[PDB]
Design a binder for this molecule. Structure first.
Ligand code: HEM
Ligand SMILES: CCCCCCCCCCCC
Ligand SMILES: [K+]
Ligand code: NA
Length: 391
């Protein structure tokens, strides 16, 4: 029960957490009020929490956080601040604006594929990781030559999304390092923001400074928090959509060959990967008031963990849920969330993967998995450090 949750955090289960997720879902919703916790795993319950007007994303409303104690980016804020801050960047991430990036993405993918040397290569280092990094750095106005340092700080803050406090009552062993990385990143971005008051940029950071300096809609601290969020999302997400999709195709009869032969399968491959092997495995909410999900009540202040990975494999929603099937009639997932905090990066992530995947398959139609992949320790933003492909 609580043993199953700790098995999820155990690194030994990272390569295949799905038996555990499925077992938890079969058992039903987990009400653990003595741990100030509730764990939802059905599609219905996760959907309901994401939409519930009393579900909060601000940690200040959390009993666990208030006890641990004894601005955050808008991912972790509620209205009105969430509404205002998301509103300020949503146009920048709209499909119409993101579509303009297709030539840059295509040139990057081609360059990266050109540089691949056989007979074996790590998809992570050679493609899945560097593509999204180049794009987000350009978008935000962060110099690509500073990437070595972003990468390490970014990796640490991605890891910080693991629900150690909720599941174990203690902070991560990485806590001190993560605070240091957070401070470094804020200071770093502050300096980039300050130079944009002197030299005109053509990037999102500059656009945000223009608004901040014109009125009361935005503070410098908020620009820092927003850009930090965007930079990290750009480093720590799409990489896993690409790599998880590659892995699922390599493991599933005919799938790599089918995409190599027909790039139009890319969209279905991507959405079925979001369902079957989600880059973001779980999200957290806090009950802003006593609330009901299905027949279960969650006390005000308790953490609600939503195991999206389990929800995507709910047999009441999808047939053969544990099969990777890009040809299935209905692909339904919550891999980009739902409602107020729905992923702002979804058009960009989709575009990045839509260009990358069919190009990869077409370039190496005879590709096979070489050995078994190695996983990072991360639970929430779960991904491979090594995915070896023999060409
Ligand atoms: C496949 C890649 C991605 C996945 C799977 C993913 C997943 C998610 C999920 C599940 C959420 C909702 C979290 C919640 O409800 O608490 C979210 C929110 C968010 N995502 Fe993504 N994301 C991806 C790529 C990106 C990219 C590339 C960016 C931009 C660089 C981005 C920017 C954001 C932002 C700003 C939010 C917060 C939205 C809000 O709070 O209003 N994402 N994402
Ligand atoms: C500051 C960390 C932001 C990285 C999150 C990227 C978007 C994915 C949402 C994950 C929510 C648990
Ligand atoms: K201001
Ligand atoms: Na908006």
């Amino acid at each position: 029960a609580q043993g199953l949750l700790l098995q999820l955090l155990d690194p030994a289960t990272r390569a295949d957490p799905y038996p555990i997720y499925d077992r938890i879902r079969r058992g039903g919703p987990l009400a653990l009020p003595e741990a100030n916790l509730a764990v939802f795993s059905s599609f219905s319950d996760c959907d309901d929490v994401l939409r519930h007007p009393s579900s909060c994303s601000d940690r200040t409303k959390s009993t666990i956080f208030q006890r641990q104690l004894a601005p955050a980016s808008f991912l972790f804020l509620d209205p009105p601040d969430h509404t205002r801050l998301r509103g300020l960047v949503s146009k920048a991430f709209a499909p119409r604006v993101i579509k303009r990036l297709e030539p840059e993405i295509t040139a990057l993918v081609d360059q990266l594929l050109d540089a691949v040397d056989g007979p074996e290569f790590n998809l992570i280092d050679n493609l899945a990781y560097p593509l999204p990094v180049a794009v987000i750095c350009r978008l935000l106005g962060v110099p690509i030559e500073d990437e070595p340092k972003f990468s390490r700080a970014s990796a640490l803050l991605a890891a910080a999304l693991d629900p150690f406090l909720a599941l174990t009552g203690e902070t991560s062993d990485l806590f001190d390092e993560q605070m240091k990385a957070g401070m470094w990143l804020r200071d770093y971005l502050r300096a980039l923001i300050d130079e944009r008051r002197r030299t005109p940029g053509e990037d999102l950071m500059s656009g945000l400074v223009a608004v901040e300096e014109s009125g009361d809609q935005l503070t410098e601290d908020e620009i820092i928090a927003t850009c930090n969020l965007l930079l990290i999302a750009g480093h720590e997400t799409t990489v896993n959509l690409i790599a998880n999709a590659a892995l699922a195709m390599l493991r599933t009869p005919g799938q790599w060959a089918a995409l190599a032969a027909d790039g139009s399968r890319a969209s279905a491959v991507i959405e079925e990967t979001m369902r079957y092997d989600p880059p973001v495995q779980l999200v957290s909410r806090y009950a802003g008031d006593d609330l009901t999900i299905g027949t279960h009540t969650v006390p005000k202040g308790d953490t609600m963990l939503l195991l999206l990975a389990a929800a995507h494999r709910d047999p009441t929603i999808v047939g053969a849920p544990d099969r990777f099937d890009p040809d299935r009639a209905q692909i339904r997932h919550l891999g980009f969330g739902k409602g107020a905090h729905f992923c702002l990066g979804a058009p960009l992530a989709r575009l990045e993967a839509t260009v990358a995947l069919p190009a990869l398959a077409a370039r190496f139609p005879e590709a096979r998995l070489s050995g078994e992949p190695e996983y990072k320790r991360n639970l929430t933003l779960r991904g491979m450090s090594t995915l070896s492909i023999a060409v």
